[PDB]
Amino acid sequence: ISPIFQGGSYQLNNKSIDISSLLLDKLSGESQTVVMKFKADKPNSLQALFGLSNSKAGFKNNYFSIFMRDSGEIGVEIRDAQKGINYLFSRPASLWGKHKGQAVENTLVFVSDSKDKTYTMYVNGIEVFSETVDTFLPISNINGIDKATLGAVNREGKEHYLAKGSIDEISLFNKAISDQEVSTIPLSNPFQLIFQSGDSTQANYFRIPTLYTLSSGRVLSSIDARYGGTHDSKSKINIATSYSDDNGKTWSEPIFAMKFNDYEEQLVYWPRDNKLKNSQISGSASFIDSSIVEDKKSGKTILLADVMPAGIGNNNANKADSGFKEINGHYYLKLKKNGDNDFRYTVRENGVVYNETTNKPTNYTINDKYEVLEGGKSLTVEQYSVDFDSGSLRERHNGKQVPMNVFYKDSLFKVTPTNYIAMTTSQNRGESWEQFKLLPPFLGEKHNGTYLCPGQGLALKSSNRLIFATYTSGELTYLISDDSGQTWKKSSASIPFKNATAEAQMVELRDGVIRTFFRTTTGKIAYMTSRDSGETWSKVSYIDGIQQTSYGTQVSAIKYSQLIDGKEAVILSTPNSRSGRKGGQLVVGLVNKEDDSIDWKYHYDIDLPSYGYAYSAITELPNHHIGVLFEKYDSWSRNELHLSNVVQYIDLEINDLT
Numbered sequence: 001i002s003p004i005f006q007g008g009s010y011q012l013n014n015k016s017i018d019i020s021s022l023l024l025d026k027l028s029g030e031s032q033t034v035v036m037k038f039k040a041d042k043p044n045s046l047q048a049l050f051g052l053s054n055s056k057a058g059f060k061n062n063y064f065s066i067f068m069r070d071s072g073e074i075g076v077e078i079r080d081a082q083k084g085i086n087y088l089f090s091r092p093a094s095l096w097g098k099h100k101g102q103a104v105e106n107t108l109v110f111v112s113d114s115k116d117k118t119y120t121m122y123v124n125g126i127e128v129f130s131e132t133v134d135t136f137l138p139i140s141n142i143n144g145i146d147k148a149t150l151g152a153v154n155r156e157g158k159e160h161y162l163a164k165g166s167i168d169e170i171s172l173f174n175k176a177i178s179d180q181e182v183s184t185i186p187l188s189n190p191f192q193l194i195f196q197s198g199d200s201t202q203a204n205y206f207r208i209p210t211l212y213t214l215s216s217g218r219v220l221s222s223i224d225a226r227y228g229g230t231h232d233s234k235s236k237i238n239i240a241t242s243y244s245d246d247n248g249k250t251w252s253e254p255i256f257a258m259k260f261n262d263y264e265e266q267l268v269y270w271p272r273d274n275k276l277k278n279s280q281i282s283g284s285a286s287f288i289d290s291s292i293v294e295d296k297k298s299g300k301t302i303l304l305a306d307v308m309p310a311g312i313g314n315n316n317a318n319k320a321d322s323g324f325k326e327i328n329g330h331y332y333l334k335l336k337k338n339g340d341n342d343f344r345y346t347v348r349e350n351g352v353v354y355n356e357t358t359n360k361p362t363n364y365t366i367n368d369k370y371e372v373l374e375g376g377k378s379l380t381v382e383q384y385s386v387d388f389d390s391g392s393l394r395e396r397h398n399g400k401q402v403p404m405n406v407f408y409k410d411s412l413f414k415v416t417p418t419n420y421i422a423m424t425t426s427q428n429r430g431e432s433w434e435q436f437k438l439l440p441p442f443l444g445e446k447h448n449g450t451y452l453c454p455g456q457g458l459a460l461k462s463s464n465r466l467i468f469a470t471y472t473s474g475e476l477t478y479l480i481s482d483d484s485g486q487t488w489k490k491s492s493a494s495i496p497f498k499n500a501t502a503e504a505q506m507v508e509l510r511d512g513v514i515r516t517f518f519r520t521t522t523g524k525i526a527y528m529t530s531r532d533s534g535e536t537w538s539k540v541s542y543i544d545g546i547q548q549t550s551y552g553t554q555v556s557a558i559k560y561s562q563l564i565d566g567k568e569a570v571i572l573s574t575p576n577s578r579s580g581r582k583g584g585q586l587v588v589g590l591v592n593k594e595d596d597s598i599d600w601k602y603h604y605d606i607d608l609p610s611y612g613y614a615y616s617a618i619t620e621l622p623n624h625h626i627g628v629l630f631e632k633y634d635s636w637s638r639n640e641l642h643l644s645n646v647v648q649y650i651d652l653e654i655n656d657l658t
C-alpha cells in the first residue's frame with residue numbers, strides 16, 4: 001500500500017521540525033510502519049529522530065520516539081502515563097555513521113503491529129529487535145498526542161533529545177507491513193554480510209572473522225559460528241567458511257570446517273537481560289579461534305582452531321595437563337573411561353584404545369573423526385538441544401542419536417578437560433574440509449596447550465615454510481612446518497607479560513624477515529621481528545600512535561603488494577581507543593629500508609570514533625582492493641552481548657586510506 005505521509009531532505013541542525021499539520025490527521029488505526037532514510041555522522045550523545053507526543057503541561061511522559069545514541073544504538077520509547085505504559089526497546093551497535101569519509105544513509109524500518117502485539121525494528125536490512133507485549137500500545141493511541149516532530153521530542157513545549165543529522169526520506173503507513181514487504185525496501189548499505197543469522201550454519205551469532213586470499217584468486221573466510229550467544233567457550237561453537245570468486249562481491253553459502261554434533265545446531269535468540277544474559281551452553285564440545293594459511297607446494301589450504309571438550313573453556317581448562325602421555329618421544333591422547341577416577345587409557349597408532357594400568361589393548365578403537373568404535377561397531381550418544389522455555393536455560397536430550405565422540409559429555413571415553421589445537425585441510429580451496437586432527441603438545445607432557453592466534457598463518461614467499469602464531473603465558477609460540485603441515489616444530493619467543501591474551505599476526509617485510517604485531521595488556525600494540533624465517537625472534541617493542549584498552553583487542557595485518565609513496569607498505573587493522581573497542585582504523589605504515597622501522601603515516605577512520613570495532617580480518621584482494629571483515633560492535637562490553645549480524649564486510653581502495 002501507499003504511504004499516508006511522505007517527506008524528505010530534512011536537515012536536523014539542533015532544531016526540531018514540526019510536521020504535525022502534515023501527519024497527525026493522517027494517522028489511523030492501531031498498526032503503523034515508519035520507513036526512514038537518515039544520516040548522522042556527527043550525532044549528539046542521545047538524540048531523537050522522530051517523535052509523536054502530547055506536548056501539554058503534565059503529560060511529559062506521553063510520547064513515542066525513535067532515538068539513537070552516539071554509540072550507534074537505535075531504539076524506541078512508547079509511553080502513556082494514563083495507561084501506565086513505559087516501553088523502551090533498543091539494540092546497541094545497529095547504525096553506520098561514515099564510510100570512505102562520507103555520511104552513510106541508514107535505512108530504518110519500524111513496524112508497530114497491533115494484531116500480533118509486536119514491535120519490530122530493522123536497520124540496514126537487519127532486524128535488531130522484535131518485541132511482543134501483553135498490553136499493546138498503538139503509537140498514535142497515546143493520550144493527548146498533539147505533535148509530530150523530526151529531530152526532537154516535544155515535551156511540555158520544549159525540545160528534548162535534539163538531533164544533529166538529516167532525514168533524506170521518511171514515509172509512514174497505516175499498516176504493519178510484512179517481513180516480505182520489508183525485504184523489498186531498497187537499501188544503501190556500505191557493507192555486506194558473508195555470515196548471517198538464518199544461513200546454513202544456523203548459528204544466530206558470529207565472532208572471530210578471518211580472511212585469506214588464495215593463489216587462484218578465490219578469497220576465503222573463516223569464523224566462529226557461535227550458537228549460545230556470543231560467549232567464548234564454554235558454549236557450542238563450530239568453525240564455518242565461505243569463499244568469494246569475484247573479489248568479495250558475492251560469497252558462497254557457508255560450510256563447516258570444524259563441527260561437533262553432541263548438541264543440535266540451533267538458531268537461538270539469546271537473552272540480553274541482566275538476569276539471563278550470562279546463561280551459557282555448558283555441556284557442549286566446541287571450537288574457537290580459527291586461522292588460515294595456503295601451502296604453495298601441495299596447493300592445500302590449512303585451517304587450525306582451538307578445540308574444547310564438553311563444558312570446557314580457557315577458564316576451566318586443565319592448566320597442568322597437555323592431555324597427552326609421552327612414550328619414547330611420542331605422544332598419545334589420554335582417555336578416561338566411564339567410572340574410573342583417573343585416565344587409564346591412551347589412543348595408540350591406528351586409533352587402538354590401549355589400557356595403561358595393565359598395558360593391555362582393548363576392543364575399543366577411535367576412528368579418524370575421534371568417534372568411538374567397539375569391535376568395529378560405532379557407538380552413539382543422544383544429542384542435546386537447548387531452550388529457555390522454563391524461563392532459564394535447559395539443556396536436554398532430543399531423541400536423536402549421533403556418533404559417540406571422545407570430546408562429548410555423554411561419551412564412554414573422554415579426553416582430558418583442557419584446550420587442544422586441531423588442524424584440517426582442504427584440497428579444493430574451501431569447497432570441503434577434511435576431518436580434523438589434533439596437533440601434538442609442543443611445550444611438554446605437563447603443560448596445557450597454547451592458544452591459536454586467530455586470523456592468518458604465514459606462508460613465506462621464498463620457501464615452503466608455514467607458520468602459525470600461538471600464545472601461552474610468558475611467550476608467543478610459533479608453530480613451524482616445512483612439509484605442508486605434516487609435521488610441526490615450535491619456536492618460542494619470550495614476551496614481558498604473564499597471562500596475556502597475546503593474539504599475534506605476522507607480515508613478511510621482505511624475504512625471511514617477519515614482523516609480528518600483537519595484543520598486550522599495556523594499552524599499546526607490540527611487535528617483534530625475526531630475520532631467519534621464524535627461527536629466532538627480537539625483543540619486544542611497542543607502536544606509538546595507536547591506543548588500545550588495557551585488556552587489548554586482536555590486531556590484523558598484511559604486507560601490501562604495491563609500493564606507497566615509493567615505499568614498501570604494511571596495513572594494520574585495529575580499534576584506536578583507550579576506552580573501548582570502537583574507533584576502528586586501518587593504519588598504513590611505510591617501511592624504512594635502512595632499518596626496517598615503520599612510519600605509521602596514514603590512519604583511515606573505518607566509521608565514527610564512538611562506533612564499535614573489535615576483532616578484524618584484512619586481506620589484499622586480487623584486484624589490489626582491501627577486504628575487511630570485522631566485528632562492528634564492542635565485543636568486550638557486557639551491554640553488547642548477543643547481537644545478530646554485526647560481523648560485516650567492506651571493500652576499500654588504497655586511495656580511500658591515504
Ligand SMILES: O=S(=O)(O)CCNCc1ccc(Cl)c(Cl)c1
Nearest residue numbers: 232233288306313314315451635
Ligand atoms: O574476550 S575477548 O578478548 O573478546 C576474546 C578472547 N578469547 C580468548 C580465548 C581463546 C581460547 C579459548 Cl578456549 C577461550 Cl575460552 C578464550
